[PDB]
Amino acid sequence: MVEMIESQTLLLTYLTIKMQKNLFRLEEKAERNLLLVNDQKDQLQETIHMMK
Amino acid sequence: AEINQKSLELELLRLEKETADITHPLYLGQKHQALQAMNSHLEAVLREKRSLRQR
């Protein structure tokens, strides 16, 4: 019984570490994409204001 | 964006203040009145030219 629980713990832990590593990579790519688009928004906003 | 809006407003108000003496209805109205008083006076003087000449 102790050997079975340990095997379960190993599976869960493996899944967890694998997911966390791949999630951090997505979050970083996402934030970068948002900042790039936000910067484009900011340039357009300044040009519109000057024209007005 | 908010700074830009307020900055424009300020610029507009400043332009209006600087040109008010020649452009605002209030100041222009006062000048009209002074001119009408003198007109009337001159009309009167011209109407009594003979009497004034005799005097």
Coordinates of N, CA and C in Angstrom, one line a residue:
Chain A
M1 N 0.8 -1.2 0.0 CA 0.0 0.0 0.0 C 0.9 1.3 0.0
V2 N 1.8 1.3 0.8 CA 2.7 2.5 0.8 C 3.4 2.6 -0.6
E3 N 3.8 1.6 -1.3 CA 4.3 1.6 -2.6 C 3.4 2.2 -3.6
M4 N 2.1 1.9 -3.6 CA 1.1 2.4 -4.5 C 0.9 3.9 -4.3
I5 N 0.7 4.4 -3.1 CA 0.6 5.8 -2.8 C 1.8 6.6 -3.3
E6 N 3.0 6.1 -3.2 CA 4.2 6.7 -3.7 C 4.2 6.8 -5.2
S7 N 3.7 5.7 -5.8 CA 3.6 5.8 -7.3 C 2.6 6.9 -7.7
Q8 N 1.5 7.1 -7.0 CA 0.5 8.1 -7.3 C 1.1 9.5 -7.1
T9 N 1.8 9.7 -6.0 CA 2.5 10.9 -5.7 C 3.5 11.2 -6.8
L10 N 4.2 10.3 -7.3 CA 5.2 10.5 -8.4 C 4.4 11.0 -9.7
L11 N 3.3 10.4 -10.1 CA 2.5 10.8 -11.2 C 2.0 12.2 -11.1
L12 N 1.5 12.5 -10.0 CA 0.9 13.9 -9.8 C 2.0 14.9 -9.8
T13 N 3.0 14.7 -9.2 CA 4.2 15.6 -9.1 C 4.8 15.8 -10.5
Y14 N 4.9 14.7 -11.2 CA 5.4 14.9 -12.6 C 4.5 15.7 -13.5
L15 N 3.2 15.5 -13.4 CA 2.3 16.3 -14.2 C 2.3 17.7 -13.8
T16 N 2.4 17.9 -12.5 CA 2.5 19.3 -12.0 C 3.7 20.1 -12.5
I17 N 4.9 19.6 -12.4 CA 6.1 20.2 -12.9 C 6.1 20.4 -14.4
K18 N 5.6 19.4 -15.1 CA 5.5 19.5 -16.5 C 4.5 20.7 -16.9
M19 N 3.4 20.8 -16.4 CA 2.4 21.9 -16.6 C 3.0 23.2 -16.2
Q20 N 3.5 23.4 -15.1 CA 4.0 24.7 -14.6 C 5.1 25.2 -15.6
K21 N 6.0 24.5 -16.0 CA 7.1 24.9 -16.9 C 6.4 25.4 -18.2
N22 N 5.5 24.7 -18.8 CA 4.9 25.0 -20.1 C 3.9 26.3 -19.9
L23 N 3.3 26.4 -18.8 CA 2.4 27.6 -18.5 C 3.2 28.8 -18.4
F24 N 4.3 28.9 -17.7 CA 5.2 30.0 -17.6 C 5.7 30.5 -18.9
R25 N 6.0 29.7 -19.9 CA 6.4 30.0 -21.2 C 5.2 30.7 -22.0
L26 N 4.0 30.3 -21.8 CA 2.9 30.9 -22.4 C 2.6 32.3 -21.8
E27 N 2.6 32.4 -20.5 CA 2.4 33.7 -19.8 C 3.4 34.7 -20.3
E28 N 4.6 34.4 -20.4 CA 5.7 35.3 -20.9 C 5.4 35.7 -22.4
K29 N 5.1 34.8 -23.2 CA 4.8 35.1 -24.6 C 3.5 36.0 -24.7
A30 N 2.5 35.7 -23.9 CA 1.3 36.5 -23.9 C 1.6 38.0 -23.5
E31 N 2.2 38.2 -22.4 CA 2.5 39.5 -21.9 C 3.3 40.3 -22.9
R32 N 4.2 39.7 -23.6 CA 5.0 40.4 -24.6 C 4.1 40.8 -25.7
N33 N 3.2 39.9 -26.1 CA 2.3 40.3 -27.2 C 1.3 41.4 -26.8
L34 N 0.9 41.5 -25.6 CA 0.0 42.6 -25.1 C 0.7 43.9 -25.1
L35 N 1.9 43.9 -24.7 CA 2.7 45.1 -24.6 C 3.0 45.7 -26.0
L36 N 3.2 44.8 -26.9 CA 3.5 45.3 -28.3 C 2.2 45.9 -28.9
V37 N 1.1 45.4 -28.6 CA -0.1 45.9 -29.1 C -0.5 47.2 -28.4
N38 N -0.3 47.2 -27.1 CA -0.5 48.4 -26.4 C 0.4 49.6 -26.8
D39 N 1.5 49.4 -27.1 CA 2.4 50.4 -27.7 C 1.8 51.0 -29.0
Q40 N 1.3 50.1 -29.9 CA 0.7 50.6 -31.1 C -0.5 51.5 -30.8
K41 N -1.3 51.1 -29.8 CA -2.4 51.9 -29.4 C -2.0 53.3 -28.9
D42 N -0.9 53.3 -28.2 CA -0.4 54.6 -27.6 C 0.1 55.5 -28.7
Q43 N 0.7 55.2 -29.7 CA 1.2 56.0 -30.9 C 0.0 56.5 -31.7
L44 N -1.0 55.7 -31.9 CA -2.2 56.2 -32.6 C -2.9 57.3 -31.8
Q45 N -3.0 57.0 -30.5 CA -3.7 58.0 -29.6 C -3.0 59.4 -29.6
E46 N -1.7 59.4 -29.6 CA -1.0 60.7 -29.6 C -1.2 61.4 -31.0
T47 N -1.1 60.7 -32.0 CA -1.3 61.3 -33.4 C -2.7 61.9 -33.5
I48 N -3.7 61.3 -33.0 CA -5.1 61.7 -33.1 C -5.3 63.0 -32.3
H49 N -4.7 63.0 -31.1 CA -4.7 64.2 -30.3 C -4.1 65.4 -30.9
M50 N -3.0 65.3 -31.5 CA -2.3 66.4 -32.1 C -3.1 66.9 -33.3
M51 N -3.7 66.1 -34.1 CA -4.5 66.5 -35.2 C -5.8 67.3 -34.7
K52 N -6.4 66.7 -33.6 CA -7.5 67.4 -33.1 C -7.2 68.8 -32.5
Chain B
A1 N -3.8 61.0 -21.9 CA -5.0 61.5 -22.7 C -5.7 62.7 -22.0
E2 N -5.8 62.5 -20.7 CA -6.4 63.5 -19.9 C -5.6 64.8 -19.9
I3 N -4.4 64.8 -19.8 CA -3.5 65.9 -19.8 C -3.6 66.7 -21.1
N4 N -3.7 65.9 -22.2 CA -3.8 66.5 -23.5 C -5.1 67.3 -23.7
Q5 N -6.2 66.8 -23.1 CA -7.4 67.5 -23.2 C -7.4 68.8 -22.4
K6 N -6.9 68.8 -21.3 CA -6.9 69.9 -20.5 C -5.9 71.0 -21.0
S7 N -4.9 70.5 -21.5 CA -3.9 71.4 -22.1 C -4.5 72.2 -23.3
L8 N -5.4 71.6 -24.1 CA -6.0 72.2 -25.2 C -7.0 73.3 -24.7
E9 N -7.7 72.9 -23.7 CA -8.7 73.8 -23.1 C -7.9 75.0 -22.6
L10 N -6.9 74.9 -22.0 CA -6.1 76.0 -21.5 C -5.6 76.9 -22.6
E11 N -5.2 76.3 -23.7 CA -4.7 77.0 -24.8 C -5.8 77.9 -25.5
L12 N -7.0 77.3 -25.5 CA -8.1 78.0 -26.1 C -8.5 79.2 -25.2
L13 N -8.5 79.0 -24.0 CA -8.9 80.0 -23.1 C -7.9 81.2 -23.1
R14 N -6.8 80.9 -23.2 CA -5.7 81.9 -23.3 C -5.9 82.7 -24.6
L15 N -6.2 82.1 -25.6 CA -6.4 82.9 -26.9 C -7.6 83.8 -26.8
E16 N -8.6 83.3 -26.2 CA -9.8 84.2 -26.0 C -9.5 85.4 -25.1
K17 N -8.8 85.3 -24.1 CA -8.5 86.4 -23.2 C -7.6 87.4 -23.8
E18 N -6.8 87.0 -24.6 CA -5.9 88.0 -25.2 C -6.5 88.8 -26.3
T19 N -7.7 88.4 -26.8 CA -8.3 89.1 -27.9 C -9.7 89.6 -27.5
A20 N -10.0 89.7 -26.2 CA -11.4 90.0 -25.8 C -11.7 91.5 -26.0
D21 N -10.8 92.4 -25.9 CA -11.0 93.9 -26.0 C -11.5 94.2 -27.4
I22 N -11.3 93.4 -28.4 CA -11.7 93.7 -29.7 C -12.6 92.7 -30.3
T23 N -12.9 91.9 -29.5 CA -13.7 90.8 -30.1 C -14.9 90.5 -29.2
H24 N -14.9 90.6 -28.0 CA -16.0 90.2 -27.1 C -17.1 91.2 -27.2
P25 N -18.4 90.8 -27.2 CA -19.5 91.6 -27.3 C -19.6 92.7 -26.1
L26 N -19.1 92.4 -25.1 CA -19.2 93.3 -23.9 C -18.4 94.5 -24.2
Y27 N -17.3 94.4 -24.6 CA -16.4 95.5 -24.8 C -16.8 96.3 -26.1
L28 N -17.3 95.6 -27.0 CA -17.7 96.2 -28.2 C -19.0 97.0 -28.0
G29 N -19.8 96.6 -27.2 CA -21.0 97.3 -26.8 C -20.7 98.6 -26.1
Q30 N -19.8 98.7 -25.3 CA -19.4 100.0 -24.6 C -18.9 101.0 -25.6
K31 N -18.3 100.6 -26.5 CA -17.8 101.5 -27.6 C -18.9 102.0 -28.4
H32 N -19.9 101.3 -28.6 CA -21.1 101.7 -29.4 C -21.8 102.8 -28.7
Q33 N -21.9 102.6 -27.5 CA -22.7 103.6 -26.7 C -22.0 105.0 -26.7
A34 N -20.8 105.0 -26.5 CA -20.0 106.3 -26.5 C -20.1 106.9 -27.9
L35 N -20.2 106.2 -28.9 CA -20.3 106.7 -30.2 C -21.7 107.3 -30.5
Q36 N -22.7 106.7 -30.0 CA -24.1 107.1 -30.3 C -24.4 108.4 -29.5
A37 N -23.8 108.7 -28.4 CA -24.0 109.9 -27.7 C -23.4 111.1 -28.4
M38 N -22.3 110.9 -28.9 CA -21.7 112.0 -29.7 C -22.4 112.3 -31.0
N39 N -22.9 111.3 -31.6 CA -23.7 111.5 -32.8 C -25.0 112.4 -32.6
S40 N -25.6 112.0 -31.6 CA -26.8 112.8 -31.3 C -26.4 114.2 -31.0
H41 N -25.4 114.5 -30.2 CA -24.9 115.8 -29.9 C -24.6 116.6 -31.2
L42 N -23.9 116.0 -32.1 CA -23.6 116.7 -33.3 C -24.8 117.0 -34.2
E43 N -25.7 116.1 -34.2 CA -26.9 116.4 -34.9 C -27.6 117.6 -34.4
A44 N -27.5 117.8 -33.2 CA -28.2 118.9 -32.5 C -27.5 120.2 -32.9
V45 N -26.2 120.2 -32.8 CA -25.4 121.3 -33.2 C -25.7 121.7 -34.6
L46 N -25.8 120.8 -35.5 CA -26.0 121.1 -36.9 C -27.5 121.6 -37.1
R47 N -28.4 121.1 -36.4 CA -29.7 121.6 -36.5 C -29.8 123.1 -36.1
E48 N -29.0 123.7 -35.1 CA -29.1 125.0 -34.5 C -28.0 125.9 -35.1
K49 N -27.6 125.7 -36.3 CA -26.4 126.4 -36.9 C -26.6 127.9 -37.1
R50 N -27.8 128.2 -37.4 CA -28.1 129.6 -37.6 C -28.1 130.4 -36.4
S51 N -28.7 130.0 -35.3 CA -28.8 130.6 -34.0 C -27.4 130.7 -33.4
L52 N -26.7 129.6 -33.6 CA -25.3 129.6 -33.0 C -24.4 130.6 -33.7
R53 N -24.7 130.7 -35.0 CA -23.9 131.7 -35.8 C -24.2 133.1 -35.4
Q54 N -25.4 133.4 -35.2 CA -25.9 134.7 -34.8 C -25.3 135.1 -33.4
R55 N -25.2 134.1 -32.6 CA -24.7 134.4 -31.2 C -23.2 134.7 -31.3

